[PDB]
Write a protein that binds this ligand. Structure first.
Ligand code: FAD
Ligand code: FAD
Ligand code: CL
Ligand code: CU
Ligand code: CU
Ligand code: CU
Ligand code: CU
Ligand code: CU
Ligand code: CU
Ligand code: CU
Ligand code: CU
Ligand code: CU
Ligand code: CU
Ligand code: CU
Ligand code: CU
Ligand code: CU
Ligand code: CU
Ligand code: CU
Ligand code: CU
Lengths: 432, 441
């Protein structure tokens, strides 16, 4: 049999695939408000359901009301897919590791093979008054706000923080981003980060860099962010401090599973841990915190268990990602700073959004297009697409890079019209 | 004037692109355009851009006049940008006037202030198409009847909009005006709604349109059109229907009669189209034809590929050809839009191949719920002997983008396994291709 700890993209997908091949499965989930995983209940689906409602400038609580019915439908849906296959017991409890072989859930469960899918949890910065102060929420709590705050304060200049910054700005709120680094989006090209910042500055969002946050109070109906004799008064404070793996009260030392400093389970290329028949897929690995990467973790584990598995984590070339601001930033491959830091000489090519007629059709001609081409192989090394529907058209750049095809096939491709993917014709035609 | 090394007839997609590429290569180029409201081509002014601009506003239930106001701002910005991007190059002469073939070397441009004569070492026909008018009495004189061009310039949203034509452009206008709050009645002469598509997706499109108020009637031979008292009356077999405005969506045919191609040795078929090579060579030497005037598929990206053919001949590297075209995609811009590539299930059944047809309802795509439009369906056809994909039917929101992903691996001859295992962005509509081709046995 098999036991998977945690309703997650890899966990629920492995549980259904195992059940259809004849395995007795037992998936353990601690919350009935988390059927479907972090993505379905408090992650992508609720965040981008509201992001889509913000770019239309609809009422904020009417959109929260609608986010509540899209997550409620999907929460019932994902529990329906799991319990209506006979093999899968759904144990509504929080699991604890007794040894390699058996698990204790708050009932003790024995398993021939265990698969860890507990995901990650929000980390709090050790700032005095961060928990003692009302009006202070993380991403989950902020998604359940009862009224639109007039002034929103965000601790963190991360991708999750920029999403909510542009999301609430479109709703009608003043947003202040408090970032500690010297650069906005330090993991990005500076021409791209300059554009994102300018788009946010035009919607009222102040980007405060080198932000020193000493304490956080509550005084006169508002939250106060102390900063060495300078207080910023906001009506609600979101904290985008990133998430770290959730291997605390699993007590994974009992099973002999080595953990690194951040709490992530040390895992193999094919997702084997230190213990003999234990696996860990998803954010708990410590890798990229994406829903698609966790699904591929199921692909790696499934090939081992049900085929004969060549599948490895050394297969994932060009993992793309998107920051669902408005317009969304999609990125795959290296940046200009990375391509220049290595030996191969490159040519950078830029297409402004003003030259994309489809962006004019959709009433948002903001952002720019950018890509890097290797003059030695005519291949593509990276792309930064800051435009409407960039999350959809970046999949085309990633797929051609996977097959190692040159940039010319995108330069000469017959696309659909009018589309955003057809601007790739205009993009890679500026290459020489 | 002098003799131009290249003379292009029309501001179409291919010609306006060839003019910039030849002027940049040193050629003395002249482009003739018969209308100063047609700078930039049919698409920019009366085609894709104003149509889709309104559909995007119609999806938001925006007031019709405000959307027409924004439609005007978009067509007028790109018309002025498309004119100046040509008129600013020194080697390009944008010549207003209606061109007419005197010879295979000279043209007669018709400007009301006295004619001009223009000669060309090479001449490129790029006149596009024009509305087909069915032979129904009282269609030219009745005031409430409109073409596709005239309907996009309406001043008031008609409470009941009638469409003559079950074609793709008509269905596009069906959703657009039914989104604005109008009752629509599309009348198709054939006995099947969208007969070139599958019945399963044609049925899905009909019910999506029906729940929005669109009435679909087949077996329609309209015999007279009348204006009696403020509403257009169309008389039929045994019944009659009255609408506020009547739109003719009966297809477009090449516009060549006023070009008079016979005087240059240029052959034409009975549709009115110029006959061409796989290199877009007309029967007369040094005369090319590009775009919808060729009788080919009426898309902007096919006219763009036509420019690629002729640019590969005039500027080197031997020759590209229209024989290079395979798996040409298209999209019907409803809500949700219908995008397609490859063969339908109907054709795949008849082929006799060992096929597998997978079906995924859009209600199972979480990103479609994120956008409040879980309508439509996904379906594709897998060939079992080769593991390749023969066709796809993407009836979803943002179908016009991810259909280019399906066309990608079909051109490269890759199996369906590529899209079943690719790491797509999330949440996305392209990622559902992971779930769509997981249904393959
Ligand atoms: C605000 C926000 C926005 C995001 N946006 C995106 C985005 O745009 N794109 C993207 O790809 N990702 C995004 N993510 C990340 C995404 O939500 C997750 O990374 C994804 O769900 C990965 O899931 P997983 O496979 O790691 O399993 P998880 O879903 O992380 O598994 C956690 C589940 O296990 C349960 N669990 C934990 N411990 C136990 C235990 N001991 N016993 C029983 N059950 C337990 C939890 O209750 C929970 O249900 C976002 C996350 C957040 C917070
Ligand atoms: C309602 C509608 C919707 C459409 N939607 C789409 C869609 O979604 N996607 C898509 O790919 N395509 C679409 N099309 C098709 C698209 O508009 C055309 O296929 C595209 O513009 C290609 O045209 P062309 O290059 O052949 O020349 P055109 O763009 O048609 O250019 C013709 C030009 O030549 C000029 N001209 C004509 N005769 C003469 C003459 N004798 N002398 C001088 N100048 C002359 C005209 O004034 C005009 O400016 C649509 C068309 C319509 C009508
Ligand atoms: Cl084809
Ligand atoms: Cu997710
Ligand atoms: Cu806006
Ligand atoms: Cu069921
Ligand atoms: Cu306890
Ligand atoms: Cu037991
Ligand atoms: Cu304030
Ligand atoms: Cu102080
Ligand atoms: Cu404990
Ligand atoms: Cu067009
Ligand atoms: Cu609606
Ligand atoms: Cu001007
Ligand atoms: Cu001669
Ligand atoms: Cu008749
Ligand atoms: Cu009658
Ligand atoms: Cu009768
Ligand atoms: Cu004539």
């Amino acid at each position: 049999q098999a036991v998977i700890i945690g309703f997650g993209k890899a966990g629920k997908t492995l549980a259904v695939t195992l059940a259809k091949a004849g395995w007795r499965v037992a998936l353990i989930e601690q919350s009935n408000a988390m059927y479907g995983g972090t993505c379905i209940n408090i992650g992508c689906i609720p965040t981008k359901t509201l992001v889509h409602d913000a770019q239309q400038h609809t009422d904020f609580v009417r959109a929260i009301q609608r986010k509540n019915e899209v997550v409620n439908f999907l929460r019932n849906k994902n529990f329906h897919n799991l319990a209506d296959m006979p093999n899968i017991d759904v144990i509504d409890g929080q699991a604890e590791f007794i040894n390699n072989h058996s698990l204790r859930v708050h009932l003790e469960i024995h398993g021939e093979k265990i698969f860890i899918n507990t995901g990650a949890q929000t980390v709090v910065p050790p700032i005095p008054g961060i928990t003692t102060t009302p009006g202070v929420y993380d991403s989950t709590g902020l998604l359940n706000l009862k009224e639109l705050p007039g002034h929103l304060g965000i601790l963190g200049g991360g991708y999750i923080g920029v999403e909510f910054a542009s999301m609430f700005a479109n709703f009608g709120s003043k947003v202040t981003i408090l970032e500690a680094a010297s650069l906005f989006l330090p993991r990005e090209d500076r021409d791209i980060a300059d554009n994102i910042a300018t788009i946010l500055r035009d919607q009222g969002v102040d980007i405060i860099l080198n932000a020193h946050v000493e304490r956080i109070s509550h005084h006169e109906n508002q939250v106060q962010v102390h900063s060495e004799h300078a207080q910023l008064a906001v009506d609600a404070l979101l904290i985008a401090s990133g998430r770290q793996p959730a291997t605390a009260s699993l007590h994974p030392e009992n099973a002999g599973i080595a953990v690194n400093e951040r709490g992530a389970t040390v895992v193999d290329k094919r997702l084997h841990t230190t213990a003999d028949n234990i696996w860990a897929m998803g954010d708990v690995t410590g890798g990229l915190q994406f829903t698609y990467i966790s699904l591929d973790d199921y692909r790696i584990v499934r090939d081992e268990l049900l085929g004969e598995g060549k599948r490895s984590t050394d297969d994932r070339k060009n993992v793309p990602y998107s920051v669902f601001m408005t317009p969304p930033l999609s990125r795959v491959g290296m940046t200009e700073e990375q391509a220049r830091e290595s030996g191969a000489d490159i040519q950078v090519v830029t297409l402004p959004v003003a030259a994309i007629p489809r962006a004019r059709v959709m009433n948002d001609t903001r952002g720019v297009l950018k890509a890097i081409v290797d003059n030695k192989t005519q291949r593509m090394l990276g792309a930064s697409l800051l435009c409407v529907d960039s999350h959809e058209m970046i999949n085309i750049v990633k797929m051609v890079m996977d097959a190692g095809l040159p940039y010319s096939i995108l330069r000469d491709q017959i696309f659909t019209h009018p589309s955003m993917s057809e601007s790739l014709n205009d993009l890679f035609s500026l290459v020489k």
